[PDB]
Amino acid sequence: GGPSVFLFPPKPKDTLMISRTPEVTCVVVDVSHEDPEVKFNWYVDGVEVHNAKTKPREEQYNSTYRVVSVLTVLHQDWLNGKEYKCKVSNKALPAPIEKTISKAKGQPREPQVYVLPPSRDELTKNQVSLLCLVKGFYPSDIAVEWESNGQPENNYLTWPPVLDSDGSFFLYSKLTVDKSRWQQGNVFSCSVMHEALHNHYTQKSLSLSP
Amino acid sequence: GGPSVFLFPPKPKDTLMISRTPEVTCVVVDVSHEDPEVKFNWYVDGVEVHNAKTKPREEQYNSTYRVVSVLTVLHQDWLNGKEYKCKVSNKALPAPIEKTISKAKGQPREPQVYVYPPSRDELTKNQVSLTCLVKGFYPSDIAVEWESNGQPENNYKTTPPVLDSDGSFALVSKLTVDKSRWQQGNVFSCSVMHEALHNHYTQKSLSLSP
Ligand SMILES: *[C@@H]1O[C@H](CO[C@@H]2O[C@@H](C)[C@@H](O)[C@@H](O)[C@@H]2O)[C@@H](O[C@@H]2O[C@H](CO)[C@@H](O[C@@H]3O[C@H](CO[C@H]4O[C@H](CO)[C@@H](O)[C@H](O)[C@@H]4O[C@@H]4O[C@H](CO)[C@@H](O[C@@H]5O[C@H](CO)[C@H](O)[C@H](O)[C@H]5O)[C@H](O)[C@H]4NC(C)=O)[C@@H](O)[C@H](O[C@H]4O[C@H](CO)[C@@H](O)[C@H](O)[C@@H]4O[C@@H]4O[C@H](CO)[C@@H](O)[C@H](O)[C@H]4NC(C)=O)[C@@H]3O)[C@H](O)[C@H]2NC(C)=O)[C@H](O)[C@H]1NC(C)=O
Ligand SMILES: *[C@@H]1O[C@H](CO[C@@H]2O[C@@H](C)[C@@H](O)[C@@H](O)[C@@H]2O)[C@@H](O[C@@H]2O[C@H](CO)[C@@H](O[C@@H]3O[C@H](CO[C@H]4O[C@H](CO)[C@@H](O)[C@H](O)[C@@H]4O[C@@H]4O[C@H](CO)[C@@H](O[C@@H]5O[C@H](CO)[C@H](O)[C@H](O)[C@H]5O)[C@H](O)[C@H]4NC(C)=O)[C@@H](O)[C@H](O)[C@@H]3O)[C@H](O)[C@H]2NC(C)=O)[C@H](O)[C@H]1NC(C)=O
Numbered sequence: 001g002g003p004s005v006f007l008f009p010p011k012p013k014d015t016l017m018i019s020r021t022p023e024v025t026c027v028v029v030d031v032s033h034e035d036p037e038v039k040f041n042w043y044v045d046g047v048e049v050h051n052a053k054t055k056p057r058e059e060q061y062n063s064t065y066r067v068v069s070v071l072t073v074l075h076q077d078w079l080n081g082k083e084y085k086c087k088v089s090n091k092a093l094p095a096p097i098e099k100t101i102s103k104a105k106g107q108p109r110e111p112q113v114y115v116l117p118p119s120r121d122e123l124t125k126n127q128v129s130l131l132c133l134v135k136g137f138y139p140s141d142i143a144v145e146w147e148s149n150g151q152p153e154n155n156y157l158t159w160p161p162v163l164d165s166d167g168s169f170f171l172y173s174k175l176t177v178d179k180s181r182w183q184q185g186n187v188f189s190c191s192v193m194h195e196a197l198h199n200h201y202t203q204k205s206l207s208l209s210p
Numbered sequence: 211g212g213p214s215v216f217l218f219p220p221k222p223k224d225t226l227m228i229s230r231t232p233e234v235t236c237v238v239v240d241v242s243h244e245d246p247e248v249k250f251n252w253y254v255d256g257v258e259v260h261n262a263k264t265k266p267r268e269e270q271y272n273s274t275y276r277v278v279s280v281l282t283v284l285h286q287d288w289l290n291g292k293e294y295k296c297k298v299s300n301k302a303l304p305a306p307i308e309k310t311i312s313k314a315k316g317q318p319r320e321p322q323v324y325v326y327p328p329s330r331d332e333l334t335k336n337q338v339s340l341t342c343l344v345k346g347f348y349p350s351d352i353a354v355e356w357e358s359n360g361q362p363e364n365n366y367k368t369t370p371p372v373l374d375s376d377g378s379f380a381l382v383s384k385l386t387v388d389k390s391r392w393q394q395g396n397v398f399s400c401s402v403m404h405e406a407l408h409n410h411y412t413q414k415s416l417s418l419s420p
Pocket of ligand 1: 221234270
């Protein structure tokens with residue numbers, strides 16, 4: 001069995017924040033010792049680009065090399081729906097394998113973000129639940145984070161988006177905080193990043209109301 | 211080659227609610243046109259039963275037959291972890307197919323159920339979201355439903371359950387109601403059904419203060 005190619009997209013968050021650097025990653029596995037050479041061609045909307053970076057081959061414990069090329073994408077190219085093509089050629093192949101990736105299609109919809117304090121009934125436990133409901137968004141690529149006092153929160157979990165009856169996605173994120181911190185008046189913030197937000201980011205805060 | 215067999219568990223609401231009737235379902239597809247006869251053996255912890263009823267086979271568009279055998283299960287057997295085995299016999303099967311199924315394993319933990327009123331921010335919109343958080347449950351089989359003044363309110367979606375940071379599951383269900391109904395004081399309740407609850411059932415309610 002000849003070599004195989006897997007093509008990976010930027011992290012949504014990397015495409016949304018200008019300070020980060022999104023990458024499309026082209027991975028070849030099952031390369032042979034007899035046919036070690038692997039070259040990469042990269043196309044954006046069909047037009048060859050030359051600026052990628054290809055690491056040196058590496059041998060897997062199974063006696064094949066794995067070779068990785070990384071293309072840096074511009075934020076707005078990705079967001080503008082450009083198609084990234086990895087073409088991987090190698091003498092153990094009848095013809096060079098081409099792969100193509102790009103952002104999910106569909107009209108963007110701006111998320112609404114709402115935060116909700118813990119239920120009265122929970123105010124009895126050792127830890128409590130702060131909720132961030134994000135709804136009405138499209139496409140489903142999104143990042144949701146929590147923080148407090150200039151530091152991230154650890155213990156949150158955020159369910160996968162699902163498709164809401166009206167054609168858009170929603171999700172929640174649950175932050176658990178020991179009741180003391182909550183009772184002591186610490187402010188907690190849910191940050192949302194999504195291409196259809198202004199600045200690709202919004203944040204909503206809440207704290208105990210006495 | 212030949213037929214393949216898939217074995218499906220009862221709906222959770224059906225195992226939890228004693229008036230309802232839970233079924234295990236044994237499905238066979240790619241049954242041949244020339245050896246279309248299929249024989250089912252059903253076992254519960256090894257003992258054969260003889261109460262299943264076979265649907266009459268059904269032609270699929272793709273030229274193959276699909277055959278269903280449905281076994282009615284006792285609520286308490288399923289809940290006590292009895293294993294259900296379906297054995298399928300076809301001419302094209304050098305050997306009968308065996309599949310086994312039983313309820314998800316794990317020490318049951320009782321869910322805590324909380325209900326969140328709409329965010330003050332949302333009150334400005336025409337529709338508002340009511341939120342039901344159910345957390346700390348084990349296993350993940352559960353059924354969550356909304357009602358008001360006794361009637362099903364089905365304009366809601368529920369995230370699938372996902373592990374929380376203690377090995378238990380959590381889930382959130384969102385009910386969307388016209389803002390008019392909310393401020394008018396109608397009461398809304400989240401019904402939750404789970405093997406680790408008392409009588410397998412509880413209901414929490416919310417409404418806007420007169
Ligand atoms: C010819 O056609 C037939 C029929 O196809 C139909 O018509 C054709 C012509 C096409 O148009 C096609 O599009 C149409 O669908 C083909 O049959 C299909 O074959 C494939 C396999 O090749 C089947 O694939 C498996 O599907 C499982 C899930 O199926 C359910 O959900 C799908 C939709 O998501 C439905 O289509 C099915 O009907 C099943 O739906 C469920 O039905 C249950 C019984 O009715 C319901 O439960 C009962 O419901 C009643 C009331 O309804 C009561 O509630 C009862 O109490 C209750 O019991 C249930 O609600 C319902 N669920 C849903 C969601 O709707 C997959 O689970 C399965 O995946 C596993 O196995 C795969 C192996 O192929 C593997 O790749 C996966 O990784 C996964 O592996 C498993 O993992 C589990 C862990 O959970 C392990 O425990 C397992 O061991 C492991 N399996 C392994 C490794 O063995 C398959 O993907 C497909 O379902 C089937 N379609 C049918 C029957 O409609 C046929 O293939 C065609 N032939 C040819 C040559 O083309
Ligand atoms: C020979 O062995 C090779 C390599 O296997 C390794 O070594 C062997 C000896 C064993 O020790 C293995 O334990 C070890 O993995 C093996 O190759 C593998 O081949 C199979 C198919 O045959 C590949 O399976 C595919 O996997 C696809 C998804 O893979 C992702 O997730 C898996 C974990 O589930 C990882 O193992 C993969 O590395 C890969 O991880 C993803 O990597 C991409 C690109 O680096 C990440 O995207 C980038 O992330 C960075 C941040 O770091 C930036 O954000 C970039 O912007 C972004 O692009 C991505 O985040 C990450 N994801 C995760 C979850 O970590 C799957 O879709 C396919 O369907 C398929 O199942 C397998 O992955 C591959 N292993 C590799 C490439 O490492 C050969 O098959 C063996 N040959 C034989 C003959 O046995």
